[PDB]
């Protein structure tokens, strides 16, 4: 339950402004994609590149999303 918590909190912190398994970073892709005005390591990078090409890519809110997470 701590992994998803850290992933989402850090993602919100970055969006408002380590590479283990590359699991935190896919969630941010929609954050940059659906934005106003528009947007072992090697295999993870390849999957991330495929995901980026798939979707056409080259605080109270943070408290809330965590709250709905648990």
């Amino acid at each position: 339950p701590y992994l998803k918590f850290a992933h989402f909190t850090a993602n919100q912190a970055i969006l408002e402004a380590s590479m283990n398994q590359g699991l935190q970073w896919p969630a941010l892709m929609q954050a940059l994609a659906l934005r106003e005005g528009g947007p072992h390591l090697h295999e993870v990078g390849c999957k991330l590149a495929q995901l980026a090409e798939a979707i056409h890519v080259e605080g109270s809110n943070a408290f809330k999303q965590a709250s709905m997470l648990l």
């Binding site: 699991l23 954050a31 979707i55």
Partner: protein
């Protein structure tokens, strides 16, 4: 002649139901199932209780259809979120959570 309706009439009828009724009718028969898997109906259902999002419907529809569709957006995460607050309307953070969950699921199931 409701037993032999074509796809267009079934879609027109199903344009005026909610999530429970649509997912319920998806088990009536094979043609009803195929018409119920339509993306437009589930997009309408998902956007019905949002009423505050805005980024352009084209971008949202394209991204959600690329990352799994609007049917996975509903059953996996939207329905559990709406379960303890049926009257509440989903605002901005709920979309940011559900879409991130869809992205993580798609990346996990990619391999």
């Amino acid at each position: 002649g409701f037993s032999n309706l074509d796809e267009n009439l079934v879609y027109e009828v199903l344009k005026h139901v909610d999530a429970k009724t649509l997912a319920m009718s998806s088990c009536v028969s094979k043609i009803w199932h195929k018409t119920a898997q339509d993306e437009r109906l589930w997009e309408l259902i998902c956007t019905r209780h949002w009423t505050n999002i805005g980024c352009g419907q084209n971008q949202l529809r394209s991204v959600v259809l690329a990352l799994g569709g609007f049917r996975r957006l509903h059953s996996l995460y939207l329905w559990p979120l709406s379960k303890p607050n049926p009257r509440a309307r989903f605002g901005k953070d709920e979309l940011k959570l559900t879409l991130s969950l869809l992205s993580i699921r798609y990346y996990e199931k990619m391999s």
